[PDB]
Write a protein that binds this ligand. Sequence first.
Ligand SMILES: CCC1=C(C)/C(=C/C2=NC(=C\c3[nH]c(/C=C4\NC(=O)[C@H](C)[C@H]4CC)c(C)c3CCC(=O)O)/C(CCC(=O)O)=C2C)NC1=O
Ligand SMILES: CCC1=C(C)/C(=C/C2=NC(=C\c3[nH]c(/C=C4\NC(=O)[C@H](C)[C@H]4CC)c(C)c3CCC(=O)O)/C(CCC(=O)O)=C2C)NC1=O
Ligand SMILES: CCC1=C(C)/C(=C/C2=NC(=C\c3[nH]c(/C=C4\NC(=O)[C@H](C)[C@H]4CC)c(C)c3CCC(=O)O)/C(CCC(=O)O)=C2C)NC1=O
Ligand SMILES: CCC1=C(C)/C(=C/C2=NC(=C\c3[nH]c(/C=C4\NC(=O)[C@H](C)[C@H]4CC)c(C)c3CCC(=O)O)/C(CCC(=O)O)=C2C)NC1=O
Ligand SMILES: CCC1=C(C)/C(=C/C2=NC(=C\c3[nH]c(/C=C4\NC(=O)[C@H](C)[C@H]4CC)c(C)c3CCC(=O)O)/C(CCC(=O)O)=C2C)NC1=O
Ligand SMILES: CCC1=C(C)/C(=C/C2=NC(=C\c3[nH]c(/C=C4\NC(=O)[C@H](C)[C@H]4CC)c(C)c3CCC(=O)O)/C(CCC(=O)O)=C2C)NC1=O
Ligand SMILES: CCC1=C(C)/C(=C/C2=NC(=C\c3[nH]c(/C=C4\NC(=O)[C@H](C)[C@H]4CC)c(C)c3CCC(=O)O)/C(CCC(=O)O)=C2C)NC1=O
Ligand SMILES: CCC1=C(C)/C(=C/C2=NC(=C\c3[nH]c(/C=C4\NC(=O)[C@H](C)[C@H]4CC)c(C)c3CCC(=O)O)/C(CCC(=O)O)=C2C)NC1=O
Ligand SMILES: CCC1=C(C)/C(=C/C2=NC(=C\c3[nH]c(/C=C4\NC(=O)[C@H](C)[C@H]4CC)c(C)c3CCC(=O)O)/C(CCC(=O)O)=C2C)NC1=O
Lengths: 51, 163, 162, 162, 172, 172, 172
Amino acid sequence: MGLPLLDTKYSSKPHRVASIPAVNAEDKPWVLDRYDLRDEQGLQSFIFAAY
Amino acid sequence: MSRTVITEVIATADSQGRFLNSTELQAAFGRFERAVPAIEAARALTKNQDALVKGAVQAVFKKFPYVTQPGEKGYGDSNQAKCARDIGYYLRFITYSLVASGTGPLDDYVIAGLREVNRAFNLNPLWYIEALNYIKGETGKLLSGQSKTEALLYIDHAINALS
Amino acid sequence: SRTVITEVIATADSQGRFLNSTELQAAFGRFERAVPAIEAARALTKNQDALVKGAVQAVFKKFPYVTQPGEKGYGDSNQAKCARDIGYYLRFITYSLVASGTGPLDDYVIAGLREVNRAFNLNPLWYIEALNYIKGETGKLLSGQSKTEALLYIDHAINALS
Amino acid sequence: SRTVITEVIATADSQGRFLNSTELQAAFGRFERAVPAIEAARALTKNQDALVKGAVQAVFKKFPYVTQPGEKGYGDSNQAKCARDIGYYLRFITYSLVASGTGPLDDYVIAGLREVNRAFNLNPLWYIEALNYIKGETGKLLSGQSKTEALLYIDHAINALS
Amino acid sequence: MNDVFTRAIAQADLKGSFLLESDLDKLASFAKEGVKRLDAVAALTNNAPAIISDAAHKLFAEQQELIQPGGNAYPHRRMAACLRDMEIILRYVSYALLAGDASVLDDRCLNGLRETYNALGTPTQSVARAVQLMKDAAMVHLKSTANVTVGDCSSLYSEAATYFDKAAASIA
Amino acid sequence: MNDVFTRAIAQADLKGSFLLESDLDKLASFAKEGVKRLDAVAALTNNAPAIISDAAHKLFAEQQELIQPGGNAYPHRRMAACLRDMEIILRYVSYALLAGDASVLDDRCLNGLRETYNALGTPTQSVARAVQLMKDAAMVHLKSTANVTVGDCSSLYSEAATYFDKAAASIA
Amino acid sequence: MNDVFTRAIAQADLKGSFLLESDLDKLASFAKEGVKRLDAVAALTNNAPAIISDAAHKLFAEQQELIQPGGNAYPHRRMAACLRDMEIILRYVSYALLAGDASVLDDRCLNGLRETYNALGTPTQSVARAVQLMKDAAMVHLKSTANVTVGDCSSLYSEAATYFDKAAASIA
Ligand SMILES: CCC1=C(C)/C(=C/C2=NC(=C\c3[nH]c(/C=C4\NC(=O)[C@H](C)[C@H]4CC)c(C)c3CCC(=O)O)/C(CCC(=O)O)=C2C)NC1=O
Ligand SMILES: CCC1=C(C)/C(=C/C2=NC(=C\c3[nH]c(/C=C4\NC(=O)[C@H](C)[C@H]4CC)c(C)c3CCC(=O)O)/C(CCC(=O)O)=C2C)NC1=O
Ligand SMILES: CCC1=C(C)/C(=C/C2=NC(=C\c3[nH]c(/C=C4\NC(=O)[C@H](C)[C@H]4CC)c(C)c3CCC(=O)O)/C(CCC(=O)O)=C2C)NC1=O
Ligand SMILES: CCC1=C(C)/C(=C/C2=NC(=C\c3[nH]c(/C=C4\NC(=O)[C@H](C)[C@H]4CC)c(C)c3CCC(=O)O)/C(CCC(=O)O)=C2C)NC1=O
Ligand SMILES: CCC1=C(C)/C(=C/C2=NC(=C\c3[nH]c(/C=C4\NC(=O)[C@H](C)[C@H]4CC)c(C)c3CCC(=O)O)/C(CCC(=O)O)=C2C)NC1=O
Ligand SMILES: CCC1=C(C)/C(=C/C2=NC(=C\c3[nH]c(/C=C4\NC(=O)[C@H](C)[C@H]4CC)c(C)c3CCC(=O)O)/C(CCC(=O)O)=C2C)NC1=O
Ligand SMILES: CCC1=C(C)/C(=C/C2=NC(=C\c3[nH]c(/C=C4\NC(=O)[C@H](C)[C@H]4CC)c(C)c3CCC(=O)O)/C(CCC(=O)O)=C2C)NC1=O
Ligand SMILES: CCC1=C(C)/C(=C/C2=NC(=C\c3[nH]c(/C=C4\NC(=O)[C@H](C)[C@H]4CC)c(C)c3CCC(=O)O)/C(CCC(=O)O)=C2C)NC1=O
Ligand SMILES: CCC1=C(C)/C(=C/C2=NC(=C\c3[nH]c(/C=C4\NC(=O)[C@H](C)[C@H]4CC)c(C)c3CCC(=O)O)/C(CCC(=O)O)=C2C)NC1=O
């Protein structure tokens, strides 16, 4: 490590305030998770999405 | 950006995205009580800063005779001045921490970056350890009661982090 | 004023002749001595306020009675004049350091010193004490030839006071 | 591109550390190998046109069908593009020799090889045959360590294609 | 995030000097009235839904153009966003009131909020009017004397008004 | 990140041609003098703390205003940051000295450092002075004839000086 | 009498202030250049009889009326006084060159010299002309490179010229 970092000095952004569902569901990014890893084609899609 | 009681309260409330619950107000009120002996200790310490600084320099010399002879760090009038200045810095930030009722001033001004700077300039931490122990001994006499303990907490914190 | 170049030129002037090797060698020595001298002057200028405050406090430490009421140190105006005089002495010492001659001191401070002190009942030992403090401190602010230059001028001023 | 020195520097920089002894020994190993490698590059540059045309004719012999009309190898434009491609491969092999690292090849030829060859329906086997011809003629054209280095880089290209 | 003590300390350190007698007196006075400050903070905190609802009611009573179709508070998506923003601003004002300085309100909340509102199409003077309505609705609960030792808190009222007005001015 | 070999390769590729015989001769000469180059980079690496301490001592003797309260290197964090920046720049200069090309130094260290210091309120002239002091301290160690075979390393000295100069010029 | 240092001290005293850092820098530059100043002054001193003789020859070839009966340099006595005055003026110019200040020239040499020459019947235009011829001969000697280490001394040349033409302006 070393020295502490400076202050973050935040700014107003959508992610900071996201209590409410986003406007469009199809425009919500796909939240890919571990249960995608069990299939084969699902695993290929997960790998492509990571890349 | 100091890490004090009120700042910790507000930061932990904002991180959780919620108003200030009653416990946080409880801690804030504890800090507000606590401020009075802290301000008393800060006053009785800033008032007698010059005696403390001189005594600390002399105590370091007494505990470390070898720094004084030529070819050492302590030999030199300018090095004497920097002795006094460094100990005055430590005392000033102890008083700041007393006022702020936290370690925020010490961590932010002295403790953060201590070891790299000491290594780069080859300053021995034991010198300041001795000076702060002298200041502790004296503030035993200057203060009494709750203020004495409150000052000793921050002097001890500085000594612990110098180690 | 009265400085090495000026003594050279004045001697040549009064003898009705040019500047010869002896006088140019004096001037040479002045031009090389200028380096520690200007350094001393700059250091003293940077620390003028600390030196003046310390000198006033040393004066009050060595002569406690003067601060007592009915005496020359009682009151704010008297101490303002304290600091003003010490600043005067410091300024003219820096002048003399830059000029490489005692001419600034002799013309601005020493000429008329005794009569003025005697008239206003000022004590020369006060200013000797202040200049001793400045000497001790410039022992720390300066080193090498800078310090010996500063000490020569401060000691000239002290000897003038005594 | 990527060489021995650049690998050293990148590895040091990713841990934020100075170059220690291991990196300098690797660099010295590179600097001592540079002489045979630059000799091999000089020899391969001297033999531009012979090697390129020989490789093209070798490809034509091993794949006689491709020169037939209605195939890839028919027509002056396609044969010119063949010569150009083999020239590219040889140029980048000499670049790798000079750099003493497979960076020139890996960055210019290999990265994107399958996608481009599949899009344009280019066969890796044509280039494998051409590079095997180049490998064969290298043994005649180079002797000693230079031949070893050139064969190493041509082998890397062949392994990449296949 | 700096409370009053921390800025007093930072200003002392920039000058490189200890804290003077008078400055310590001021900080001790602040700490003494900290109980009143805590009561004000609790008055804002406990009554927050009432303040938000009251200000929203008044704002949509004066400016109906928000809640008609084509208005900027029309669907439940946008109305709930309005109420969320108002709660955020009230929360940050409570933080600033407890701390004693508008530093937190400066950095965590109002950093670039006008630009966001302009990009979304929100009317900024409408948001400022909403914050002003929140201030007017929250002074009522601040001045409430139920279950509280009665005394003078006019300095705290002015301080809270300053924080609300500062948020409103920054947004507008 | 390019060394001299990769720079020559890239120019040759842009021209679309093999490397000329003169370019091969220059690269062969570079490889031959690489042993002295490795000695120089080792001298920089193995004396980094000494170089930084010497440069720091000179710099803060010369420029006392930094170490004063309100100066840019006052608290321990800023002093530590000063020393850390000096070590970073020395590290990248050693990288460049090994590679023989200042592309690494410009790309990874100096590309946006002046605006970073301006954003941080740092006297860039002082940083350039610090880099020059590091140059002097490093040239004292590079020219150390003891413990190494004696030879002509004037070219290496000039390259190291050019990298230090280019760092200082790019910062300030 | 004044040199450059003593004038600087005089204005500083008039303000009542110390000498600023820029003034100290100018005086440091002066004292650094002092050795070149000494060379210039020694060139004026060493070659003085040659300068005076050359100026006299040129002046009395130009203005033959001065050496005819009824001229103002006619009898031996007036010619001796003429040459004496030229020597005196050159000598005070050398003084001013060493001092860096034209104060001694004004106070001693040119204090009332125009009224002196007007009362004597001496042509002040011709005296100024003699000063110009002396200036030319002086520049011939001062630009000489033999027996000095080569260097830039143009400031000294211009300053010597200003002393000469200031004398000539005061006379005529
Ligand atoms: C925020 C608070 C703060 C601290 C504490 C601090 C410590 C500090 N002390 C310094 C000098 C120094 N300080 C000392 C202190 C020693 N002298 C000996 O007689 C004693 C045993 C001992 C003191 C009692 C010495 C010897 C030096 C000179 C080191 C050197 O120049 O190599 C320096 C180098 C800066 C310079 O002189 O240009 C630092 C950074 N700096 C800070 O900004
Ligand atoms: C150019 C150089 C220069 C000097 C040095 C100088 C000294 C000086 N200081 C004076 C005032 C004074 N100076 C002092 C002395 C100080 N006060 C005491 O407490 C201390 C012990 C002491 C500090 C060392 C006092 C007491 C006075 C007021 C004297 C009076 O008005 O009766 C006066 C009387 C005129 C006035 O009212 O200002 C002179 C002439 N004047 C000059 O023009
Ligand atoms: C980085 C170095 C690099 C390489 C190696 C490279 C190969 C390459 N060769 C190409 C064309 C081609 N190259 C060939 C080569 C064939 N001709 C004969 O038949 C032989 C059997 C065979 C060669 C051994 C042919 C036929 C084409 C035309 C492909 C088409 O247009 O369908 C193309 C398509 C671009 C174009 O239309 O010119 C590429 C990308 N490109 C590069 O930038
Ligand atoms: C933690 C500090 C913080 C704040 C305060 C903040 C405000 C904020 N409010 C937003 C949306 C919004 N804000 C509002 C509220 C306004 N419009 C109506 O006219 C009302 C009168 C008025 C409320 C008083 C509305 C309607 C939206 C949604 C706009 C849209 O969906 O197009 C957005 C954009 C993200 C989103 O689409 O949900 C931000 C960043 N962000 C932050 O990070
Ligand atoms: C659990 C969290 C917590 C709270 C809420 C808190 C507030 C608090 N306020 C107090 C007194 C007080 N509180 C107030 C504040 C009032 N001044 C005006 O009347 C307003 C209606 C109102 C604030 C705007 C005043 C004036 C006092 C008496 C102190 C004085 O001024 O002498 C007391 C002492 C009285 C008692 O305990 O019976 C507490 C504990 N302290 C806490 O640890
Ligand atoms: C790889 C290229 C690179 C470099 C070198 C770099 C330097 C750098 N210096 C910084 C601050 C700093 N830099 C300095 C150094 C200056 N102050 C002193 O006066 C000296 C004159 C001088 C050093 C010789 C200081 C004191 C800070 C701290 C400022 C602060 O803490 O607010 C910071 C950000 C704050 C932090 O987290 O510490 C960076 C990123 N960044 C990069 O991407
Ligand atoms: C593991 C890392 C490593 C090191 C440490 C290393 C040092 C090293 N230096 C050498 C010679 C040398 N070393 C130097 C360098 C010195 N010349 C001047 O004295 C300078 C002060 C100084 C460099 C700045 C020179 C000029 C030679 C002769 C090179 C030659 O013979 O061509 C040699 C070859 C032995 C010989 O020629 O007799 C080696 C192996 N090589 C390495 O791979
Ligand atoms: C009051 C009476 C008076 C006398 C006596 C006098 C002597 C005299 N002769 C002069 C010219 C001269 N006169 C001579 C003399 C002669 N040349 C040679 O043919 C002979 C060997 C030699 C005489 C035996 C010389 C050599 C000069 C040259 C001065 C010059 O070149 O400037 C000059 C210089 C003025 C000029 O340039 O003409 C003077 C002062 N001047 C007077 O006003
Ligand atoms: C006893 C009387 C005395 C004299 C005469 C004297 C002159 C003197 N001239 C010097 C060099 C020099 N002298 C000159 C001036 C000359 N260069 C150009 O040719 C100009 C035509 C001309 C100026 C009028 C210069 C430029 C230097 C080099 C040193 C420097 O530039 O700082 C030096 C320094 C050492 C050296 O380089 O020789 C001295 C001490 N010092 C004395 O104590």
